[PDB]
Design a protein around this ligand. Structure first.
Ligand code: A1IPV
Ligand code: A1IPV
Lengths: 261, 260
């Protein structure tokens, strides 16, 4: 591909990424660092501040239980929203809607988890995570200190995010990276791998040029970012095993179960 | 960042060490596998009696005996990879604990990678290439052993579709060893500095040697994902086997690597 076509693809994905997702990394960083002019987020650091944050912020999430469960269900509620946002974004990826419909379903099914982890890092620092489009901030130490298996379920997300954020990618970088994850030709059950790798080869070309122009000083950043797809594959399988352990230990309305299946 | 003439110098140096360290290259393995030759023809083991005939012909209970044949070559491979790693510029200058840590977690991923060179879809070379044992025979071993053999073939068929030669693999293997993300490393930065140079060398090598193969660099790094997951499955499968087979000891080299 000619470089001007790669740049056009990079911008097409950036513009769609801005429309699809509620809180960009650029805004998230201004909040976390405290450089923004907007109001300080509500901070949840323990039981009583969580209670006020629900009565203050309008948590649609569960808020119909026990605190560790309620938080867990808040992460699931937001993840369900993120899947729809990613599904919408994927449609803007040139070539995606022309794929066999079953393959589109399969690529989203196996990709959304890796993309959620990746984009969750945009909302985290070493001390906590933004919530509710940035109106709130809940501390890492509070999440890490939840009882039984919940504390150990939260912390791996921060340990990854802290590592991923040291690459210092911005939104224009992430927009292409996310597209590369979706167009993975090795997902189980794909019917027609060739046009998926064909598209990914083009996204990879655009990612490489984007990182060289946007980060001329960061050597082999392309490779370092692809190496992070190893971090992603491993933590997602670990994650699946942690949910399976939770289910066998911790009922919900059958309709709710369907929603979260 | 490096000048390209220095990157090519590193590519030749690593290919040269790889030829010196590893007994059976992919180029030789492919010549044996494709045949057309009379001198290099292997004896083929496809069942019990041909295996029994195999001792008197080549140098090679059956589920265990074959397993011990795989572990013997694995231990030799750890020795070969250790020798190779010492040739990687900068490696012997790292903190001694980090040298051990990089080998500890790197050898398995490299064994799988290089085992693919000895395989096609129908079986694997053995006894320095004098033999060939069929995939379906290995898959048909009893107990848990059959299902322990087959995943190695499932990876190899996919990896081999990249059509790397030895000069590519020499650099790829070096990149794997110098991973700064291994658990417990003391000084990550000097390791990442070496990997950046190797990555630069791999990228330029793949562009010159495989100019028609678009984004092969990226596709090869993506295979380092398959390797991380398949090594974990291997370890977990070995541990389950151990808890059943008391007539199985492991070489101290392998035994230490699996400890933690
Ligand atoms: O915006 C966003 O983009 C977003 C995206 C993701 C999360 C989030 N998901 N999550 C999961 O377990 C998870 C993941 Cl990674 C992938 C797939 C499926 C799942 C799940 F299905 F199993 F969940 C987390 C675990 C811990 C934390 Cl720290 C965050 C996450 C996210 O979390 C916002 C958040 C943080 C803390 C309290 C909270 O709920 C509250 F409002 F406080 F009650 C909400 C945001
Ligand atoms: O040369 C070589 O480079 C070489 C390298 C690797 C193997 C080989 N190892 N292996 C393992 O299980 C394994 C691995 Cl990956 C990593 C670490 C530890 C282990 C182990 F500790 F747990 F083993 C395999 C499983 C199945 C097969 Cl197909 C091959 C392997 C290799 O296998 C040669 C071989 C194949 C079949 C019969 C046989 O024995 C016989 F000659 F028939 F007697 C020898 C060669």
């Amino acid at each position: 591909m000619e470089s001007a076509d790669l740049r056009a693809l990079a911008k097409h994905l950036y513009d769609s990424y801005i429309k699809s997702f509620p809180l960009t990394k650029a805004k998230a960083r201004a909040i976390l660092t405290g450089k923004t002019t907007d109001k300080s987020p509500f901070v949840i650091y323990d039981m009583n501040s969580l209670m006020m944050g629900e009565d203050k912020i309008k948590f649609k999430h569960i808020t119909p239980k026990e605190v560790a469960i309620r938080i867990f269900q808040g992460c699931q509620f937001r993840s369900v929203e993120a899947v729809q946002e990613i599904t919408e974004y994927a449609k803007s990826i040139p070539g995606f809607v022309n794929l066999d419909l079953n393959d589109q379903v399969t690529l989203l099914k196996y990709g959304v988890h890796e993309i959620i982890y990746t984009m969750l890092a945009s909302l985290m620092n070493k001390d906590g995570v933004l919530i509710s489009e940035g109106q709130g901030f809940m501390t890492r130490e509070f999440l890490k200190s939840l009882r039984k298996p919940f504390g150990d379920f939260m912390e791996p997300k921060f340990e990854f995010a802290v590592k991923f954020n040291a690459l210092e990618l911005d939104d224009s970088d992430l927009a292409i990276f996310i597209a590369v994850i979706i167009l993975s030709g090795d997902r189980p059950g794909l019917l027609n791998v060739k046009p998926i790798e064909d598209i990914q080869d083009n996204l990879l070309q655009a990612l490489e040029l984007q990182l060289k122009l946007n980060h001329p000083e960061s050597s082999q950043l392309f490779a370092k970012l692809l190496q992070k797809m190893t971090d992603l594959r491993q933590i997602v399988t670990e994650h699946v095993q942690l949910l399976q352990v939770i289910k066998k230990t911790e009922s919900l309305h059958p309709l709710l179960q369907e929603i979260y299946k």
